[PDB]
DNA sequence: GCATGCATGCGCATGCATGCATGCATGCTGCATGCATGCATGCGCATGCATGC
């Protein structure tokens, strides 16, 4: 139940299976062994000055793309801190990302690469899924000829990543089931034979196609994506991938691609090992200096566009954005092996949230993007 | 161009013509008993012949 090239399962979800294995004396090993030379290497690299760039660079070493896009995948892999209350009530740290933008980009490869690095996952198309196919169903076993219950797409993705491609092409009936999985990370089934609540602790990675040929900078974002504006606010990060014609970016991309048809970064093994180590041992906790900045940032974000709320030009800010900042600060702290979330983490989180939506080039009144200011 | 109702396939649940073994009981039938009958047998007695005297 291990592989060098894939990540280790989340121990936060299998606590009692570990206890049962010891009571049953089965030596099936779930997590991998770490020698001390390799653990010394871990801190030797974790001390490096350019850790953040190096990690972002080694995520997908064959996708010439902005490092902001890759950093989101890197922080999605680490995940937020899972918190358990002793009076019932669970808070989880799963990150949800949307990749909107023109076609003819490398969004598709990101989803495939993330499918193949995460231990548990399922790949779904837009107009190829049903509610029954995502939740559960009853089937006839050709061996015993009786009726048994079988798991669905989202329940099989418990403690992993689920990749939904062409999210905008999906029916309102099928989009209905995702609300509960994005709110409470559960599913409630009341069908003939089963009345129970299931655990779906999964990360959502979705890509959407813009209306018409290309993204139109002259129109607002709410008019370019066929998705209700209220649904757009449930995602932690929204990535606008825009295409601009610029001669030195094109030159670099062409050389990059042609170099692959001939005959520093961290190899796959070391990357996965580092991520598993961090996800396994350390646990970050927030401080007051971070709380001040979090509250200030949320108030500042809400105060913006207070007048531009009746008209759906920009995406209105809600409490889920506050929770997104919390989650991203905790993930950035987990990277670099700290147990303390300082002010740098919150500043980086807010920087990333604004940079994803391209808020450094938007007219706050007409929701339009100046492409002369969108630099590669 | 937007809103609407119809007809087209999914996705459940139930009934239904085929088909074959098992335990109980039916229904016949081969077997054992009893008996009538008529032909042959194993027998002792009376007659007629042959052999002395």
From Swiss-Prot:
Location relative to the cell: Nucleus
Tagged with keyword Nucleus: yes
Keyword Hydrolase: yes
Biological-process GO terms, alphabetical: DNA replication; DNA replication initiation; DNA strand elongation involved in DNA replication; double-strand break repair via break-induced replication; mitotic DNA replication initiation; nuclear DNA replication; pre-replicative complex assembly involved in nuclear cell cycle DNA replication; premeiotic DNA replication
Effect of residue 107 to A: Loss of MCM2-7 complex helicase activity
Coiled-coil regions listed in the entry: none
GO CC terms in record: CMG complex; cytoplasm; DNA replication preinitiation complex; MCM complex; MCM core complex; nuclear pre-replicative complex; nuclear replication fork; nucleoplasm
Record-listed ATP binding positions: 101-108
Any one GO MF annotation of this record: helicase activity
Key words of the record: ATP-binding, Cell cycle, DNA replication, DNA-binding, Helicase, Hydrolase, Nucleotide-binding, Nucleus, Phosphoprotein
MCM domain sequence ranges: 51-258
Motif Arginine finger, chain ranges: 233-236
Family indicated by similarity: Belongs to the MCM family.
Assembly and interaction partners: Component of the MCM2-7 complex. The complex forms a toroidal hexameric ring with the proposed subunit order MCM2-MCM6-MCM4-MCM7-MCM3-MCM5; loaded onto DNA, forms a head-head double hexamer.
Misc: Present with 8800 molecules/cell in log phase SD medium.
UniProt function note: Acts as a component of the MCM2-7 complex (MCM complex) which is the putative replicative helicase essential for 'once per cell cycle' DNA replication initiation and elongation in eukaryotic cells. The active ATPase sites in the MCM2-7 ring are formed through the interaction surfaces of two neighboring subunits such that a critical structure of a conserved arginine finger motif is provided in trans relative to the ATP-binding site of the Walker A box of the adjacent subunit. The six ATPase active sites, however, are likely to contribute differentially to the complex helicase activity.
Entry protein name: DNA replication licensing factor MCM4
Primary gene name: MCM4
Residue range from the parent sequence: 468 to 852 of 933
């Amino acid at each position: 139940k291990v592989s060098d090239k894939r990540l280790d399962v989340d121990t936060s979800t299998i606590e009692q299976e570990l206890m049962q294995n010891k009571v049953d004396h089965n030596e099936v090993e779930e997590v991998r062994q770490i020698t001390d030379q390799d653990l010394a290497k871990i801190r030797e690299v974790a001390a490096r000055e350019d850790l953040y760039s190096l990690l972002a660079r080694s995520i997908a070493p064959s996708i010439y793309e902005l490092e902001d896009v890759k950093k989101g995948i890197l922080l999605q892999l680490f995940g937020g801190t899972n918190k358990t209350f002793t009076k019932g009530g669970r808070y989880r740290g799963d990150i949800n990302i949307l990749l909107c933008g023109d076609p003819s980009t490398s969004k598709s490869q990101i989803l495939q690469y993330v499918h193949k690095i995460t231990p548990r996952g399922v790949y779904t198309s837009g107009k190829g899924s049903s509610a029954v196919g995502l939740t559960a169903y009853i089937t006839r076993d050709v061996d015993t000829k009786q009726l048994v219950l079988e798991s669905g797409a989202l329940v099989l993705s418990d403690g992993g990543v689920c990749c939904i491609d062409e999210f905008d092409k999906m029916s309102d009936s099928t989009r209905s089931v995702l609300h509960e999985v994005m709110e409470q990370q559960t599913i409630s089934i009341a069908k003939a034979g089963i009345i129970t609540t299931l655990n779906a602790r999964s990360s959502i990675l979705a890509s959407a196609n813009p209306i018409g040929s290309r993204y139109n900078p002259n129109l607002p974002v709410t008019e370019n994506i066929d998705l209700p504006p209220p649904l757009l606010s449930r995602f932690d990060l929204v990535y606008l991938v825009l295409d601009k014609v610029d001669e030195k970016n094109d030159r670099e991309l062409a050389k990059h691609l042609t170099n692959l048809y001939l005959e520093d970064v961290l190899p796959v093994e070391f990357l996965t090992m580092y991520i598993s180590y961090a996800k396994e041992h350390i646990h970050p906790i927030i401080t007051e200096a971070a709380k001040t900045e979090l509250v200030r940032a949320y108030v500042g974000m809400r105060k913006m566009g207070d007048d531009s709320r009746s008209d759906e030009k920009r995406i209105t800010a809600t409490t889920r954005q506050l929770e997104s900042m919390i989650r991203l600060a905790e993930a950035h702290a987990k990277m670099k092996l700290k147990n303390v979330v300082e002010l740098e983490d919150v500043q980086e989180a807010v920087r990333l949230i604004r940079s994803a939506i391209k808020d450094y080039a938007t007219d706050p009144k007409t929701g339009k993007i100046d492409m002369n200011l969108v630099q590669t």
